[PDB]
Design a protein around this ligand. Structure first.
Ligand SMILES: C/C(=C\[C@H](C)CCCCC(=O)O)[C@@H]1O[C@@H]2C=C[C@@H]1OC(=O)\C=C/C=C\C=C\[C@H]1O[C@@H]3C[C@H]1O[C@@H](/C=C/C[C@H]1O[C@H](C[C@H](O)[C@H]1C)[C@@H](O)[C@@H](O)/C=C/CC/C=C/C2)[C@@H]3C
Length: 50
DNA sequence: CGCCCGCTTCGGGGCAACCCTGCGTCTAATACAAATCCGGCAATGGAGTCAAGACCAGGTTCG
């Protein structure tokens, strides 16, 4: 946003144009898969999930 | 008696070898020439195929 605040022209831009959500959604998808703390639920008896 | 000056001794620095406190989207085409694929006839010419048809030789039948 701070980059394209300057390169864009004024009196034409909007928050729909300024905002790129793809690094945020890539950070979420890169956390939930392929991290240490996000593991498969160990279920072979209900004590193990707990 | 004091004094220089390199010899040894330790310090500090410097450096070489391993992990994560690591791990962004970008003008946009035109113009043209050469090379290459490929699609479709257009000569085949050699290689396979059918069929007749002849070739006797020795069992096989008949005299
Ligand atoms: C070594 C480790 C996790 C190991 C893979 C499993 C735990 C080892 C301890 C043990 O031997 O009991 C650390 O885990 C985390 C971050 C760093 C380390 O990961 C690491 O560095 C190693 C792997 C990190 C993420 C792996 C994700 C995916 O790999 C597959 C699918 C995803 O997860 C893995 C499965 C994990 C569940 C395990 O659960 C364990 C039993 C089995 O070993 C597994 C079913 C149970 O002990 C379970 O109750 C306990 C889990 C530990 C909780 C997380 C701690 C920190 C499966 C192999």
């Amino acid at each position: 946003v701070r980059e394209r605040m300057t390169t864009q022209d004024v009196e034409a831009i909007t928050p729909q144009t300024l905002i790129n959500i793809r690094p945020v959604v890539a950070a979420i998808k890169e956390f939930f898969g392929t991290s240490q703390l996000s593991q498969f639920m160990d279920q072979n008896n209900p004590l193990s999930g707990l």
